[PDB]
Symmetry: D3
Subunit: 257 residues, 6 copies
Amino acid sequence: KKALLVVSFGTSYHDTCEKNIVACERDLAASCPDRDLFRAFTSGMIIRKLRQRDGIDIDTPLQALQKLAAQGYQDVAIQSLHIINGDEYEKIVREVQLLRPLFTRLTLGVPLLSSHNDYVQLMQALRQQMPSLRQTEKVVFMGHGASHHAFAAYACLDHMMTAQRFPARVGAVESYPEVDILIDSLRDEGVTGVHLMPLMLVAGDHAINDMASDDGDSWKMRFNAAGIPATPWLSGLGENPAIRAMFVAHLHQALNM
Amino acid sequence: KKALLVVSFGTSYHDTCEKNIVACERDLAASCPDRDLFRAFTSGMIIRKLRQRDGIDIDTPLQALQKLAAQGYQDVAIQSLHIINGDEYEKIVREVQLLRPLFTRLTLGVPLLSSHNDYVQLMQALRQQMPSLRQTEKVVFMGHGASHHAFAAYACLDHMMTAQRFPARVGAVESYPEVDILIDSLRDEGVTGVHLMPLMLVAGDHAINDMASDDGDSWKMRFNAAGIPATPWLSGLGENPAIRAMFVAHLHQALNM
Amino acid sequence: KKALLVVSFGTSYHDTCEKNIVACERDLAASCPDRDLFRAFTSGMIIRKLRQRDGIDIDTPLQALQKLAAQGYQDVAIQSLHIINGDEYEKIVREVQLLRPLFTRLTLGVPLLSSHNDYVQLMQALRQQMPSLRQTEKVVFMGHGASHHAFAAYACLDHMMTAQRFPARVGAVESYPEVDILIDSLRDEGVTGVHLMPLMLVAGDHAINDMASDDGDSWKMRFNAAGIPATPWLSGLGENPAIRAMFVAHLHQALNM
Amino acid sequence: KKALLVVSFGTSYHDTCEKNIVACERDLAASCPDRDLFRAFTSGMIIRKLRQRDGIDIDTPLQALQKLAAQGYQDVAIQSLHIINGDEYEKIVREVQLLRPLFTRLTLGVPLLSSHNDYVQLMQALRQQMPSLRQTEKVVFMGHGASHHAFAAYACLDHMMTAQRFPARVGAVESYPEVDILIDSLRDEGVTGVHLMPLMLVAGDHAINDMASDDGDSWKMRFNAAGIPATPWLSGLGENPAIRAMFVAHLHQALNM
Amino acid sequence: KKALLVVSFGTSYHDTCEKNIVACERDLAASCPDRDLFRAFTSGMIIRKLRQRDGIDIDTPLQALQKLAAQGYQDVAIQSLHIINGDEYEKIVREVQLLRPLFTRLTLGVPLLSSHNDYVQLMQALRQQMPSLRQTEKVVFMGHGASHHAFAAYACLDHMMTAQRFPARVGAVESYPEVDILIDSLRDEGVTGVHLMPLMLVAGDHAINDMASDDGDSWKMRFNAAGIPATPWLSGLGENPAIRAMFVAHLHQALNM
Amino acid sequence: KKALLVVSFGTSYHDTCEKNIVACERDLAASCPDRDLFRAFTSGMIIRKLRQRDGIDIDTPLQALQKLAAQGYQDVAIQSLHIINGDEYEKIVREVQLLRPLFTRLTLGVPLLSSHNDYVQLMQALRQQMPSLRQTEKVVFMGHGASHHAFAAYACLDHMMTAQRFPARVGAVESYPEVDILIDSLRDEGVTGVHLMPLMLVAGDHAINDMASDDGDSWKMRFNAAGIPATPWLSGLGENPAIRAMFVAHLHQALNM
């Protein structure tokens, strides 16, 4: 008796949830058609907003696991839709560790950016949502960032891009490299325009405001103020089938050893 | 009743242990003169070699904690001398988690490269073991690397160096960026010579062989083969007082909140 | 400050719950008149049906334990009303293990079929719900079965019956021995009629359908098709005072050592 | 990201809750202005009464911790408003122990009467809610008591008072020294009148009934029957700023080491 | 970095250990050639005898796991060589549960007699160590037995044999069915001779004494006294390649899901 | 399969160990003649001294429990020979909590001074090692003391003695009431001589030095300097059969509920 639990950071914005979190849950459920599908979010604030504003009840990972144990699932596979191994993913790791003894079999599949091969595969996957660029144009990816030590992931990926002359850059809102680092670096290459894309699973209004709004600290205004015009593309990573396939391979690696 | 437990990766080489692990234990003990000092190593292989070859018994973190609980220490402060938050540090985290209920108070201080400020402070600390360089010369730091996701730390630090035009580079033996990435990148800047230094707590013969030997895959031979002569400096980071002071600040941050 | 928690598999059928689970809770509470009485069910599906269809709220064992800890019970005795040591009982064992540290004293009394003496005592107890049979008639007991390894209990009990020439047989719906095994074996003895009784705590409509319905795979139709007419008796084991007394002795054995 | 959780025994009486538990939560929050403030009660019975009678929902410590983990608090400081280290405080210790792995940093500050210095400081703090007495008058403090071994605290404090000729006595409703012990002892000194004060955080109607009512077993009637007239003062300890400052020092000692 | 830990009940008899436990460890290691091989025994008494008499040190499962964690194995596969899910296997389950958090990945493969298919496959495997029998001759298998509830396994297997007219019987030394049950049952079939084989992983001198000695309570003397001559075959199950292949399939099922 | 583990604080002095710890282990083993007897000490320092000076190996409670689990004991009863519920007893509680899942049944019997009835029974038991005193003479008991909150036990017992006019007093070396408190209080009663007895399980040379030596801070010199001559009696509490019987009743209360 078998479950698949898919844990997202979450979003209160319905249309982006459907285009991204649902599309990933759909693909993961198809790869495990012998599993019943369940959802949980790590963001308690988002869960609370959904309850109070919308009357929609999303489980935390602890609640989802308690319910799975209650309903008699002995075998639970969990897949994180997080991008990095930071506080949010670790919330899953810790809750899983606490309740692990309630199950005969548990596995837990890791965030997008975990191993060295993940970074290589992610660059390949990102290539499928990028346009054909001229030599003085680049795509710029905007991640959340982190205070947790896993914030190092964003710079490592940017470093790999630069080393292989991939035509994109990566930074973070809340951590290094911040947008001014990339702007200084791109200005020195004589990059002439950029396309901004989120390096986040969903693109909710606040992500959109950090990237694209008319606020002077938006990434678009910052690039524009440097004389490098910026065109925002408002899709989450969940909307890219090659990203979904990496989440599917992680679940399947958690399943096999 | 109070203990300080200092946990290193470890080394079987006595002279480097004294110059690096002992110098750090000395400084940490001085900052907590109300604590009795204890040692443990994460590397079981190194512990085994010390027992079998030398008749020297070093505790694992689990054994050190069992002994501390037995001897009646209610208050234990632990400081990791690791460089990154990878498998080795996590071995400490997990053993601490298991035995935490044996103590009234426990804290655990983090590896050198944890927060965004650690990277900035580490660059400042490394500056005190570097020579005054000409504009076409750089220091190259050689870390261990990791398969764990924390391998991203080495590239993030290299990325920070490059962004601020710090006159050094960082890579890893076993993970990205490997030495050929740095060589290609430095050759493109017209860097003319490098000084190799380990980005490891100790400099044991095997680290020395990866960095400095006459094997074609040593970092020195690789730089030399690219026509960039390399001068190896065989000190561990433990020998740098500004690195020791960061480990001391981490212990003290674990102590205060 | 003392509690008695009685944990059943559960049922959504009110009349069988009263005749079986309530009768057992009543007897256990009388044997521990210094304890406040609490209920929990292992079947989450049954709990959910009761909430959604009936507005009746039954605790899982985890919820019951959290509430007991909250209300200040330091001393909790738990008795399982399960028949075997399979997945359902183990759900209790695991939840008890997780929350055990919340209590000064906990005990947990075992399912009906645990030790060698339980099987002997159960045969004696079953004898009090059986009629006086002619030599070519037998009682046939229908257990649930299990995929868990404790499914072996049903065959072991059948084996004991046969060895001592007890005038009954035991099998399981979902596991070995299935009804065709018993039918082949009884047909070879020249058994001429059987009375079917559940070897389950309660007799809900679905148990009744497996045993007694006009579906060709019901145990009654299967015996009838073999030319051995079958008379269904629709009581759960909870309705037998000698079964209740075994559950009472298990609680009391959990209490004493 | 930082929380302060303040855990009380609790009360269903609103006016005493405000004058005592709120005043303590207020002071603790002011000493940690970087923390978001949360409440939990140990008394499940009181929590249940508040829900069912008032529609007010107070968390148990387990629920508060689950919610804190859900909302992403990595750093939680908890302060107990209990008077002694008995069953109620231990409920906190046990729930904290269970959920500790959900947090990067946790601390837990201890009840009022913990160390030898607490007793000395409490005597000093009580002096600020006492009147100037004549030599044949004393204040009598009425604690709850305990079956747990920490009941010894009340006699130890009474013993310290007597040794230093502090003009007060301490006993307990439910444990040693009960009021008749103090009455016999005070009668032998020729004490002529007493003022009764609770040695409890709040003064709810039931505390007030034990201390002050016209029931023959109230502490006031007992002293009066011995010919030592008793004047009840119906404030909880929470109403005394010097008691609040001890709870603040405990939180701050939990924070520093 | 990957380990295989093979846990036996154990034996102090060297020749049977080699022919049985070593042959199983050999096969399991060949099926996981990417794993380093480790041993542990559940029988502490046997471990103690080996240390004190022979100077041979065998790990308990806890010690083996501590050492694996120390040496940096992140991925450990464990296979039990036990026959049933009783106290001995559960010792593994409990120690694994305790130390599970020390590893990134752990699995645990189950005893020979676990699922319904195991019993069918075991009957097939036993057929390869049996002779071609005449119709009045049978093989009798002698298991250890158990007080734990898993003792039911031996009767369940005997029941399956009888149902399918397999030409063997199974019982236990220490639990039901004891040898007299099988003797009474075989005498009633007019069975004329039996071959005794152990249903134990190893055949040490004490197993051999229970089965084969000249003591009146040996299984051989008991059958002989009933006028059914008994020929003892002194091999453990480990010596049967089809049994080894079931242990290999269990490890591989633990590995895949 | 059943064990009795008796855990002492410990002593390095052989003669006092035999007269006290052995006499208690003897009595406890006689009350549980179905249990195999085991020893552990809480004092790691004492354990270390015994190993290094004497070649005697005493288990910590963790080691004793690991060995019990290894040897297959499913049912372990543990009895503490401690006097109070302080750090030493809690070391047992915590180690028991950690390893509890390794056993089917565990219980843990509490220190001498736990419940209100323990204090009453202890006063009765102490009466059997006291002489017949004149009205101006008293026995003075010398406990260890504690920084842990359970130090309150010593004053509570002294308070009970005084309240009931029992002809003894109690204090502690390391905590309140210290000897000067008792001396001031006894001098005010016109007590003319005292007999000093330890309120410790064993009377080792250091206890003897605190109580009896010619050092000015010994309890004997302090009483003598106050003009109240003191006669030391150098027996531990273990030597008193009525104390042993309380430890036996605690084990038996842990066994029954």
